Design a protein around this ligand. Structure first.
Ligand SMILES: CC(=O)N[C@H]1[C@H]([C@H](O)[C@H](O)CO)O[C@@](OC[C@H]2O[C@@H](O)[C@H](O)[C@@H](O)[C@H]2O)(C(=O)O)C[C@@H]1O
Ligand SMILES: CC(=O)N[C@H]1[C@H]([C@H](O)[C@H](O)CO)O[C@@](OC[C@H]2O[C@@H](O)[C@H](O)[C@@H](O)[C@H]2O)(C(=O)O)C[C@@H]1O
Ligand SMILES: CC(=O)N[C@H]1[C@H]([C@H](O)[C@H](O)CO)O[C@@](OC[C@H]2O[C@@H](O)[C@H](O)[C@@H](O)[C@H]2O)(C(=O)O)C[C@@H]1O
Ligand SMILES: *[C@@H]1O[C@H](CO)[C@@H](O[C@@H]2O[C@H](CO)[C@@H](O)[C@H](O)[C@H]2NC(C)=O)[C@H](O)[C@H]1NC(C)=O
Ligand SMILES: *[C@@H]1O[C@H](CO)[C@@H](O[C@@H]2O[C@H](CO)[C@@H](O)[C@H](O)[C@H]2NC(C)=O)[C@H](O)[C@H]1NC(C)=O
Ligand SMILES: *[C@@H]1O[C@H](CO)[C@@H](O[C@@H]2O[C@H](CO)[C@@H](O)[C@H](O)[C@H]2NC(C)=O)[C@H](O)[C@H]1NC(C)=O
Ligand SMILES: *[C@@H]1O[C@H](CO)[C@@H](O[C@@H]2O[C@H](CO)[C@@H](O)[C@H](O)[C@H]2NC(C)=O)[C@H](O)[C@H]1NC(C)=O
Ligand SMILES: *[C@@H]1O[C@H](CO)[C@@H](O)[C@H](O)[C@H]1NC(C)=O
Ligand SMILES: *[C@@H]1O[C@H](CO)[C@@H](O)[C@H](O)[C@H]1NC(C)=O
Lengths: 309, 175, 171, 309, 172, 309
């Protein structure tokens, strides 16, 4: 009595996966779809990185001493550190976050002169917080005041037409003095006003004296369009203006760069390298990343139902 | 276990069938022997490689930072962002859960299918020359040496060649 | 539908079959008789519970308020919240629909499968002692009394003991 | 000939469900997956609630008469009410919603004194807008004013270092007089200036006489950190600051409280109690909730196809 | 196919079956001919029609403008919108990729089961009067004319009528 | 030997589709699920359309000459155009997009006279910037100024209570003159304070001369509630108030109107008409739209595998 049989393979102990109707059912082979192994470095290989070190991202636009070496740069991968600072002298940017969001995808920046020549005022206003080898204030800015103490500052109009291919990033500052008296000493008595106008933008600023500070503001000037500054004091004038290069990623991290691993997905704690559809590492990422899931492990059957002998 | 072969009528798998996925095991006058099946192993594997192509190495979506982790952004917009992110997490954790659980349901049943298909292939080959024992084996009603066993495995078995003997072994009554 | 047994080659169910999901109904010299099957009935509910254990009693995520009901917030932001929220509703209403529709199809086809799987376990066990209607009955070609019927029911039926008798009845 | 037949159970009581192929096929048994059964109550069992009633949430910081018993509270479920009010005297908070959102997850507040002692000035400025036994003020606040009518308010500094382990919620106010005449009566005459300066926060304030109001402003002062108040009038100063307890959940509702039902999903008109994955009750919920869908019913099969006899 | 009929034991399809989806091709002493089973074509078309019924004519919910392409909005909110929008697109693109991929799988296998079912019926209908060849044919063992082949398609084949006769042929 | 053979149909020209395991497998027939056919027309049949053309949406509230046509417009579909503007005399609405969004769903506006009368001043303030056959003003506003140059402005109070059953849109404006002398010439000398108070809104305004503008401000006033205005110059008065008619959809487009095609899903580049569940036309849609995807095509199989001989 001859016979032939039909059957399938099995291993001693397979791996447990979940199906629609059963939990932890053993199969011959399965593979992981959720990446949990993190590379604790910023993988810069192939990219041209910019570790901003002690320079805050926004510093690059106004130019405090910590950013002297980043006033112009080119990068497809910008790495912000926690110890970076945008300022040298009290004050915040308005919209600081969207400006970061814009700079993080700029591909770097390049400065160009606006060519403002000033008549009948003092240009060389300085602070000891900003003083350095180069100049005694923000590198890209000019602190404008009266020819003498308490002297009247003239009503003034300055305009800049963007002569370029792409939109310009225009930064100006408003000076809030330590006191009314101090505001008088730099710009003279009288109520002061700053108005900035392009064909998109229209905004009025009054100094609010009381606690020494310089608050900065910004807009995006259309190519061929003109901006207009009218001011009778407390005005921090741009000397240069930035132009964005190409396309970059912006990472906030405390991990060191490593120029010998290819990275596409980044987060506060390094790099995720994975052709896996999902990741459990970090929910806040930047680049081409696996989707963040809250599960540690999702095993996907690469084999059949394991039935031991 | 939809097709009732694996974890159904086939009692168990063979721990010593490393030559492939689905196989044969003969018992003739010349002893015992195991050989594997290329046609049906490959049919299954190709349909499993297919699933991996679909999920592994897919082009990821572009991601950009909307939060700020160094200097915290205004509270209200921070909560809207946080809320939105957590909805995504809920959505994608749902999808992944289900994607995998479904692909795993299909993988197991697709595998069962190939076993059942091969079994039905062999069942039809042998025709009247054998009977099913209910455990996945065929009681062959004629002498089938190593060459004969080979012909079955590689689908060249000629039932008309052995029919006459087999019937004399199956119908054990007068007509 | 997929397997062709339930609402396929089998006409209908039995409203009288209260003892279980799938079962046998024998007719012979000693009246009728219906009796359920365990393994295949049990197996099917093992699966249906599995589906339920994956849906019922989930751990949900916590979500804080982002709106304000009593002090209407800035419409710009609210309308963004309202967009997102309604967009989320669309994604879930979809999933819910498709999950429930998808899982249901699988339930229908899995249950038809357990019928077939059992039907084939029997077909094989009888060997050449019985033929097939195609309506889900096996015409047995020998006298199988009520105590013989039960051997078939729980896989102890020895076909060899009735084979010679059966074969002549098929002529 | 004798025969054995095969089959499955059936009923008359069959439920119509939906599959990928047919809408309204009949199965033996089904089970609803969308929750529609609402409880018209806020479920507070196993928790520790705080129904705020007439007391508006931010009222717990400054202490108008409505909010007297809620000045320090311990809670993991804060309930706002339609009737709650934040103020007694006309005035508003800055970034009120932001503050509300951080208060709702505080775990409740604990209050501590700031060690503020004043002399050369009056401390007891009351109003008829807040009544306890007649004219009163904000309980956690002091309205500072000149020693008599038209008397000059002294120039002052007030410092407070956070002694604790967690951050502190410093609230101060500015008083905007009915007219210049009224401001000259309360405090001195002349420019009035307030500066609130922490290590991470600078902001000058000047009062604007025109309509009677008191505007409240705020910061989170970090541990070991000092906040500094320099002012010459129009200053509603805090007597007490506030520290958060742990974790709580905020709710808005009109439903009454019930300590005999358990639940984690709350909304506009009550609580959702369910193990179901979806709900059709309210698109806007808080806590740990099933997902809102728009279907009334999505029935899951729990039996086979029904083909009655 | 999960059932092993279409692109399985059945070598290929028939480029001349205009009547329906599945048919009967008979060979006899009378000559060759081809028909088509209505019941199994119709059973398969409704399951495809039902698939399109759930996907076509869907009522969608209303959505209003949240941004402004003429006078651009505050870039904080703006970017949050864009960021969300991008994720929404990714979810739906994923779901559309999956719905179709998943539905097409079930469609192919559903049509295959139909083939399998129809074969199954004819097998059981023919009883001990015919033997399956393994490529989708049944060798009928009694002489069976155009009227006779009719009874199989028409599903009214009294097997008893031809048993004794076609059995004798099965031994010889 | 007589044989009966079973088998399926095939075509010479199958279509390619994708499954879970196969990609590019061939089927008898397939159906597209992604819409790519666009109508370059705004499909208005059935609708009551409004093509605002030269007139900006917020403009319909104040009434510059461009919006004389639509001062009390009525539609269920509001089509903005790129050339449309909201103002003629320089100046900007505050929280403008919030107002825009509200107006887009409003069903149109019905203007109702607020019933304000003034003596002791002039109410006929017109300007050349807004000509309507000679100098005029915004048709729903009144420019209040002194009887003669440098005459003092009387402290005025005007109250309006909402007699309707639905909220009332209240617009007013703060005119900022050019010079300090300009402001004194049209109104009094000294601080010009505007105060607007309802039972859920309190706000004050100070004019900022130096660059001329009328900046518009709004509030939603509930039924049987009052708005009070207290001012002394620089104030631009409402003549009429607005009420929303019902429901509408707002579209932004450069596409022409067509009253012969019908549709319900709109975007900047036309109308999408489709039963199909997805679309690859434009991601930024308004109305009842098919879900947007990235794929050009996704074919759904409507027939078995194509196996030709
Ligand atoms: C005049 C000028 O352009 N810069 C001054 C600067 C400004 O007056 C001030 O930053 C305006 O807000 O003051 C600087 O000097 C040193 C001196 O300043 C007092 O105001 C301060 O109390 C002390 O720190 C004192 O040492 C400065 O650098 O900050 C000098 C600079 O020339
Ligand atoms: C003096 C003081 O600290 N509080 C006053 C209070 C305030 O001066 C005022 O609210 C700040 O704008 O005014 C209070 O009084 C009653 C009385 O006030 C007159 O000024 C007003 O003209 C009258 O109509 C009448 O309201 C008050 O109760 O708020 C008295 C309080 O002592
Ligand atoms: C008075 C009035 O209602 N409208 C005036 C308008 C306004 O007074 C002005 O916009 C408010 O700041 O000014 C008009 O002015 C003539 C003249 O005014 C000088 O001050 C200015 O320096 C000149 O350039 C010139 O414009 C105007 O230009 O429209 C007249 C209008 O009737
Ligand atoms: C949004 O969520 C995140 C948490 O995922 C908050 O960010 C952090 O929260 C942790 C709490 O353990 C703290 O260390 C910091 O406050 C945050 N650090 C980092 C690196 O993100 C964030 O605070 C939340 N936003 C709001 C408004 O609550
Ligand atoms: C966002 O949607 C909510 C719905 O939850 C709106 O709030 C409702 O407002 C309508 C009238 O517009 C009332 O019928 C309801 O009573 C409100 N419900 C709640 C829970 O508040 C809200 O108006 C919308 N927001 C914006 C900015 O349009
Ligand atoms: C968010 O995305 C939109 C659309 O991708 C951006 O608007 C486009 O970009 C520029 C303007 O910067 C125009 O040339 C295009 O015509 C715009 N398209 C549309 C459809 O509006 C928008 O700039 C992005 N927002 C931010 C803050 O970057
Ligand atoms: C194959 O499928 C196509 C489209 O999926 C069918 O084409 C439709 O045919 C009808 C006429 O019967 C036309 O009115 C429609 O306009 C077509 N639809 C589309 C979307 O183009 C076609 O009928 C199918 N072919 C066969 C032979 O059935
Ligand atoms: C099983 O899958 C894994 C992928 O995780 C692979 O490394 C392994 O070689 C596969 N096969 C076997 C027989 O283990
Ligand atoms: C069937 O469903 C009903 C209603 O959902 C439920 O009461 C019951 O528990 C289910 N099971 C049985 C065996 O009836």
């Amino acid at each position: 009595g001859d016979k032939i049989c039909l059957g399938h393979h099995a291993v001693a102990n397979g791996t447990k996966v979940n199906t629609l109707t059963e939990r932890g059912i053993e199969v011959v082979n399965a593979t992981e779809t959720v990446e949990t192994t993190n590379i604790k470095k910023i993988c810069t290989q192939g990219k041209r990185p910019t570790d901003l070190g002690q320079c805050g991202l926004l510093g690059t636009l106004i130019g405090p001493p910590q950013c002297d070496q980043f006033l112009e740069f080119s990068s497809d991968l910008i790495i912000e550190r926690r110890e970076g600072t945008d300022i040298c002298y009290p004050g915040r940017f308005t919209n600081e976050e969207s400006l970061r969001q814009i700079l993080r995808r700029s591909g770097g920046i390049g400065k160009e002169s606006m060519g403002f020549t000033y008549s009948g005022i003092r240009t060389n206003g300085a602070t000891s917080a900003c003083t350095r080898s180069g100049s005694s204030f923000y590198a890209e800015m000019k602190w404008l005041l009266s020819n003498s103490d308490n002297a009247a500052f003239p009503q003034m109009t300055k305009a800049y037409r963007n002569p370029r291919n792409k939109p310009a990033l225009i930064i100006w500052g408003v000076h809030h003095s330590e006191s009314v008296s101090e505001q008088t000493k730099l710009y003279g008595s009288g109520n002061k006003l700053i108005t900035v106008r392009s064909s998109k933008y229209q905004q009025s600023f009054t100094p609010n004296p009381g606690a020494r500070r310089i608050d900065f503001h910004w807009l995006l000037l259309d190519p061929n369009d003109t901006v207009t500054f009218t001011f009778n004091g407390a005005f921090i004038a741009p000397d240069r203006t930035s132009f964005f290069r190409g396309e970059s990623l912006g990472v906030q991290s405390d991990a060191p760069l490593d120029s010998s691993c290819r990275g596409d997905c980044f987060h506060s704690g390094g790099t995720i390298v994975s052709s896996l559809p999902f990741q459990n590492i970090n929910s806040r990422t930047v680049g081409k990343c696996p989707r963040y899931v809250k599960q540690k492990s999702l095993l996907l059957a690469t084999g059949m139902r394991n039935v031991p002998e | 276990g939809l097709f009732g072969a694996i974890a159904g009528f086939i009692e168990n798998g063979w721990e010593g069938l490393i030559n492939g996925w689905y196989g044969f095991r003969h018992q003739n006058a010349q002893g015992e022997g195991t050989a594997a099946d290329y046609k049906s192993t490959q049919s299954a594997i190709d349909q499993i490689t297919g699933k991996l192509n679909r999920l592994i190495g897919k082009t990821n979506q572009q991601f950009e930072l909307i939060d700020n982790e160094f200097n915290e952004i205004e509270q209200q917009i921070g909560n809207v962002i946080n809320w939105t992110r957590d909805a995504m997490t809920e959505i994608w954790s749902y999808n992944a859960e289900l994607l995998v659980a479904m692909e795993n349901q299909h993988t197991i049943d697709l595998a069962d299918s190939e076993m059942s298909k091969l079994y039905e292939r062999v069942k039809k080959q042998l025709r009247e020359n054998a009977e099913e024992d209910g455990t996945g084996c065929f009681e062959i009603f004629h002498k089938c040496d190593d060459q004969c066993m080979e012909s079955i495995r590689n689908n060249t078995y000629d039932h008309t060649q052995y029919r006459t003997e087999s019937l004399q072994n199956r119908i054990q009554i007068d007509s």
